[PDB]
């Protein structure tokens, strides 16, 4: 079973490494044998801040949801993951959303990392200082790009809201590094 | 000045398709074989209007441009 807490934790820490947040080297590289100590599992770091859950309920109820909002708002954390192990209650995550954003992952959807797979080129989320040039050199607009949708599992991976623009550097076989810019919806 | 410094093959269909049309309709010569000589000697009174997809344009003349 310890795959499903080691490989999971090795996914989250590579997740929040490439979400931009401060992630150290060796704790990415913990083998399962070196993991033979350890809910009792929570990753808590900040940006270059983030909380990580594992609810002991396999199915999260709303009675669980109002518990940690006491420690959400007091401990001044905003972004937080909930690894809901099986799966109405999503409307609770709409309620607290415009202040502090949270989101929901299935357990076995996360057992392996999809960014490492070869048919997924390495996306990069762009900043508003960089968007404001790409809208100007090509003389593009706010729309009028290849759109990407909200519930996309790489949009869900990086935590992209509606309105950002990611770049895509794919290794292609006529030039080598064709670069494409996905608008998010 | 971000348009291509050559003549695309669609301009040359519409330059020579119309320049031979006016020479057929009693214009000063500077019908189809007439305008082929004028382009390949670069004497044509036409300025190409190339838009851009933003809405803008760029006005090019033939002597500013490299013909095929």
């Amino acid at each position: 079973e310890t795959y499903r807490l080691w490989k999971i934790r090795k996914t989250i820490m590579q997740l929040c490494h490439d979400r931009g947040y401060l992630v150290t080297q060796d704790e990415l590289d913990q083998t399962l044998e070196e993991f033979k100590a350890q809910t009792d599992l929570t990753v808590l770091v900040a940006h270059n801040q983030m909380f990580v859950f594992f609810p002991e309920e396999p199915k999260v109820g709303i009675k669980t949801i109002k518990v940690y909002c006491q420690r959400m708002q007091e401990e001044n954390i905003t972004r937080a993951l909930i690894v809901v192990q099986q799966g109405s209650a999503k409307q609770s995550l709409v309620d607290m959303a415009p202040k502090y954003i949270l989101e929901q992952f299935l357990e076995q959807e996360l057992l392996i990392n999809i960014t490492e797979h070869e048919l997924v080129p390495e996306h990069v989320v762009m900043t508003k200082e960089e968007v404001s040039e790409l809208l100007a050199r090509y003389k593009l607009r706010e729309n009028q790009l290849p759109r990407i949708q909200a519930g996309d599992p790489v949009a869900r991976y990086f935590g992209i809201r509606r309105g950002q623009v990611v770049k895509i550097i794919r290794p292609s076989e006529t030039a080598g590094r064709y670069i494409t810019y996905r608008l998010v919806q | 000045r971000i348009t291509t410094p050559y003549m695309t093959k669609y301009e040359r269909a519409r330059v020579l398709g119309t320049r031979a049309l006016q020479i057929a309709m009693c214009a000063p010569v500077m019908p189809l074989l007439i305008a082929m000589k004028e382009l390949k000697a670069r004497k044509i009174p036409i300025i190409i209007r190339r838009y851009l997809p933003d809405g803008s344009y760029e006005d090019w003349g033939v002597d500013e441009l490299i013909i095929t």
Binding site: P121, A175, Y178 | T4, A20, R50
Partner: protein, 1000 residues
């Protein structure tokens, strides 16, 4: 509207319209000072004669009552003459020549449309003339014209020079001169080839062993086409080097000389071999379709053993003496065993028939010459027709186990299911005439179906890309003015001005790369011999010279590595615009260079010449930091090749160019690269819809029922699959991977059940079986959970021996999962596989009386258990791969590529996430073919990349080819909006008045 009839005496862009049809059509001419003295004759004649006119738009109906008061004609008027020669009509755009009968002759029904203006005429002329967008009779006879044997005496040259067009009046000097001065047919065929053109191809008879030490450039069959300097030195031609294929001599003469120089290269060979053949003829007697008796008796000595070795496998399998190969039953492995012994004798009678045909045999002149392919369709003339099939199977039993009323039952033999001993020359048995009437019916319908399949994809996929264009940003934009691609085809380059080239830094090893490209400047005898005496001190002295040439090689090591990232496959065939080994092979001819002398080129001029060139090739404009990285990625793949084949060592050693050569060479690339930049104005939608529906006409379902399914993206694949690779040491063993194999199959308990019954044994000490009373007591000597009342029934299920050790199943994990599946209120008792009978006893702890409810428990465990594996996952195969594409590609410590085998898994049924998650399933190389299932896991960028992996796979299975730029537009109009969906003149002109003031 009338027939088309063939006519090889028209220059290709011509049509023969007869005078009963051109005397109804009109081309409304507007009067100039030119024609005002010409058209008055054509007004004077009227509608009586042929060269006349109908209307005069002054609108006078000049066909009856001519009224000579109104025969005025001043400039500005519009006259509607009938027709003449030289005019242009539409299909492409032909040109009217008049040939008087009732048929439309054209050099290979149709209507005829005629445009009505001098603007839309010239749109057809400079875009869509017939050359701007080779018959059997010519293409065979080119083989016979171009051997060593053929000599033309003196008078026949004076005819085959009369039928050229591009000829300059001067007769060549012949080869032989002791008799009459005989001209070889290769000398005259050198006169057609238009100017300096270079090529090397191999005729379709050339053995691969002929490239040994001796007889390399001689090749005593006179194969190996070598056209140096536009003059045919050696070699026979064929289809392979005169069609339109890669590296073709007609292909090369479109990338050097234009198109109106190549249309003359057709209409010369469409005459001088079409009109030499009146001296050869090329008949087909029936003597050209008879085997000599040396092989004709031996061709039966195969088939008399074929029908023996089918009897050998029927009587072997009718005695239970044939082990079933795993994957299929004894039935399906019987058929695969016998269709093996009827496609080897179909081919051992197929290679010995082609080789046995004589050198004069006229079938061999239409196969070796390659003009008519399908060399299997004349192996049925001579030797053996072969097997018949319907539905992919040899003939099913129609009547009742008897395919015809002439046979016995139990006839699986080699003739009572379809195979044909006889060939069409010897005639066919009256049974086998019926069976070939059945194989000709299954293929006679599919033709009537595959005209309502690929006649519908191509007229639907056009309405997908109806107006996707290239705007003047050279982005890719369409009707709803959205950006599809930022640069057209990932580098901006255009479609029909690229070739196949090789890199030669990717493919070789690590030691060879420091031997082939290193340029050791120190050994002093190389550069003595490979370079001039004036520079032999110049290289050795200055350290500033010697420290640039490392920085050439410094980039090439860091150019080597990026090729081993973009191309992990070790496949070095690259599509790239200007061929940097023809244009070096050219420059050793224009400038008359002797390569056996020391060169005279300065090596810094090589390095500086490349670097100053690579800035002059502008795909993306601008001096921004945005467009700077956005440029050098569009020309990374080409700028690495551009240093590999223009190195400081490769110029001076393999190529021997001179100082006046390299000045011409680098400046010609820039003049030839700048044409392959795409012209903004291209209707790319028609160019890329008509390059995917054309190879639509030519057990994973491949071809049209797969290609139809990706056009609408069906949610339910008729054959989904999931190819699965492996990670560790399990990849190299079949016994380690059997644990991986059994964890994917949906194994219920129906698969392992021997039989099932219900007894009523309320006392376990007195069961109806006395044999189990040993171990039933063992669970009841120290009994557990017999607490209040066991229900007095007994469900007794027996298990198996094969299917229970095939998956290493445990009696515990069956009993534990039922106990975990239904709670402790189902008293399940496992027993031992140590004895030869495996028993599982299932009792019940305390409406729906217990005899019925024990069945419903039993009727759930037959259907819904999931003992192991994942649901909706059928038969899970396993094999080591045979093809060199799906193998594992590990770079060794000498940088060499190496293919390494490993056990792969090809399943049925798709559930991607649980499959990826389990132990030693590869995170990286695992991929499915179900687009819908791959879009809900990996994103949208494993649809855009992996709808390519399917459209390339429904095309390259036929061996065919599609340029990649026509796949990156079907993959990029479906996935534009983030989710997959189904299907179902920008510029202007201004008048320049400042130029218009002067000019008479």
């Amino acid at each position: 509207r009338t027939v088309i009839t063939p006519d090889p005496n028209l220059s290709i862009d011509q049509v023969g319209v007869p005078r009963s049809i051109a005397a109804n059509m009109t081309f409304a001419e507007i009067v100039t000072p030119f024609n005002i003295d010409r058209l008055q004759e054509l007004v004077r004649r009227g509608n009586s004669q042929y060269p006349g006119a109908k209307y005069i738009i002054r609108r006078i109906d000049l066909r009856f009552h001519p009224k000579p008061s109104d025969l005025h004609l001043q400039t500005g008027y519009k006259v509607e003459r009938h027709m003449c020669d030289g005019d242009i009509v539409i299909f492409m755009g032909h040109r009217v020549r008049i040939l008087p009968w009732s048929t439309f002759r054209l050099n290979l029904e149709m209507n005829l449309h005629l445009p009505q203006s001098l603007e839309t005429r010239a749109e057809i002329q400079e875009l869509a003339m017939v050359p701007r967008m080779i018959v059997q009779d010519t293409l065979t006879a080119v083989r016979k014209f171009t051997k060593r044997d053929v000599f033309l005496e003196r008078g026949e040259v004076m005819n085959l020079l009369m039928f050229l067009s591009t000829w300059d009046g001067k007769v060549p000097q012949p080869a032989i001169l002791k008799p009459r001065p005989l001209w070889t047919g290769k000398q005259i065929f050198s006169l057609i080839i238009p100017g300096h053109i270079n090529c090397i191809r191999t005729h379709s008879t050339h053995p691969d062993d002929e490239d040994s030490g001796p007889y390399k450039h001689i090749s005593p069959g006179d194969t190996k086409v070598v056209v140096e300097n536009g003059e045919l030195i050696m070699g026979i031609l064929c289809k392979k080097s005169l069609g339109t294929s890669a590296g073709s001599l007609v292909h090369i003469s479109y990338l050097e000389m234009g198109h109106d120089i190549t249309r003359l290269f057709y209409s010369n060979i469409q005459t001088v071999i079409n009109n030499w053949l009146l001296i050869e003829g090329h008949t087909i007697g029936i003597g050209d379709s008879i085997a000599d008796s040396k092989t004709y008796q031996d061709i039966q000595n195969t088939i008399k053993k074929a029908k023996q070795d089918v009897i050998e496998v029927i009587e072997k399998a009718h005695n239970n003496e044939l082990e079933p190969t795993p994957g299929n039953t004894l039935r399906q492995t019987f058929e695969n065993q016998v269709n093996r012994i009827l496609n080897d004798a179909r081919d051992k009678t197929g290679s010995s028939a082609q080789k046995s045909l004589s050198e004069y045999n006229n079938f061999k002149s239409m196969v070796v010459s390659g003009a008519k392919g399908s060399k299997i369709n004349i192996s049925q003339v001579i030797a053996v027709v072969g097997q018949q099939n319907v539905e992919g199977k040899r003939i099913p039993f129609g009547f009742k186990h008897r395919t015809l009323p002439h046979f016995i039952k139990d006839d699986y033999g080699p003739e009572s299911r379809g195979f044909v001993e006889n060939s069409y020359l010897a005639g066919l048995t009256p049974t086998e005439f019926f069976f070939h009437a059945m194989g000709g019916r299954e293929g006679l319908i599919d033709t009537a179906v595959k005209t309502a399949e690929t006649g519908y994809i191509q007229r639907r996929l056009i309405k997908s890309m109806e107006s996707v264009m290239v705007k003047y940003d050279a982005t890719v934009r369409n009707s709803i003015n959205q950006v599809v691609q930022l640069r057209y085809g990932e580098d901006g380059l255009a479609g029909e001005s690229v070739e196949f080239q090789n890199l030669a830094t990717l493919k070789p090893s690590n030691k060879a790369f420091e031997k082939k490209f290193r340029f050791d400047y120190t050994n002093e005898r190389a550069l003595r011999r490979t370079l001039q005496e004036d520079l032999v001190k110049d290289v050795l002295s200055n350290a500033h010279i010697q420290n640039e040439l490392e920085r050439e090689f410094e980039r090439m090591r860091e150019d080597r590595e990026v090729l081993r990232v973009i191309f992990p496959t070790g496949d070095s065939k690259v599509v790239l615009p200007c061929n940097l080994l023809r244009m070096i092979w050219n420059a050793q001819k224009i400038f008359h260079i002797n390569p056996r002398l020391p060169s005279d080129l300065h090596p810094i001029k090589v390095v500086e010449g490349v670097k100053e060139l690579s800035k002059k090739l502008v795909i993306v404009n601008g001096d921004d930091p945005l467009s700077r990285q956005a440029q050098e990625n569009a020309t990374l793949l080409f700028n690495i090749h551009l240093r590999s084949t223009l190195c400081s060592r490769r110029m001076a050693e393999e190529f021997r160019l001179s100082g006046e050569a390299f000045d011409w060479l680098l400046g010609e690339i820039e003049s030839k690269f700048n044409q392959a930049i795409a012209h903004p104005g291209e209707m790319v939608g028609a160019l890329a819809a008509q390059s995917l529906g054309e190879p639509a006409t030519q057990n994973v379902t491949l071809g049209v029922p797969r290609l139809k399914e990706l056009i609408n993206i069906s949610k339910k694949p008729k054959t989904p699959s999931l190819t699965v690779f492996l990670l560790g040491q399990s990849a190299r063993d079949a016994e380690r991977a059997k644990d991986i194999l059994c964890r994917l199959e949906h194994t219920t308990l129906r698969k392992v059940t021997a039989n099932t019954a219900i007894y009523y044994d309320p006392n376990p000490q007195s069961t109806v079986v006395a044999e189990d009373q040993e171990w039933v007591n063992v669970y009841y000597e120290m009994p557990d959970f017999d607490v209040a009342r066991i229900s007095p029934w007994l469900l007794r299920v027996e298990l198996d021996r094969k299917h229970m050790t095939d998956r290493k199943l445990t009696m515990e994990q069956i009993a534990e999962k039922i106990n975990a599946g239904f709670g402790d209120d189902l008293n399940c008792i496992f027993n031992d596989d140590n004895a030869e009978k495996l028993v599982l006893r299932i009792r019940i702890m305390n409406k729906m009386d217990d005899d019925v409810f024990l069945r419903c428990i039993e009727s759930n465990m037959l259907t819904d258990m999931t003992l192991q594996g994942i649901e909706q996952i059928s038969k899970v195969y396993m094999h080591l791969p045979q093809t060199d594409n799906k193998k594992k590609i590990i770079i060794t410590e000498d940088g060499e590529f190496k293919a390494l085998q490993e056990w792969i898994l090809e399943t049925d049924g798709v559930s991607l996430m649980r499959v990826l998650s389990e132990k030693d399933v590869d995170p990286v190389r695992t991929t499915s073919n179900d687009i819908v299932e791959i879009f809900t896991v990996l994103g949208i960028e494993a649809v855009r990349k992996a709808l390519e992996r399917e459209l390339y796979h429904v095309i390259s299975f036929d061996g065919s080819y599609v340029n990649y730029r026509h796949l990156a537009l079907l993959c990029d109009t479906m996935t534009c909006r983030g989710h997959l969906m189904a299907i179902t003149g920008c510029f202007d002109l201004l008048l320049d008045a400042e130029k218009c003031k002067y000019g008479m």
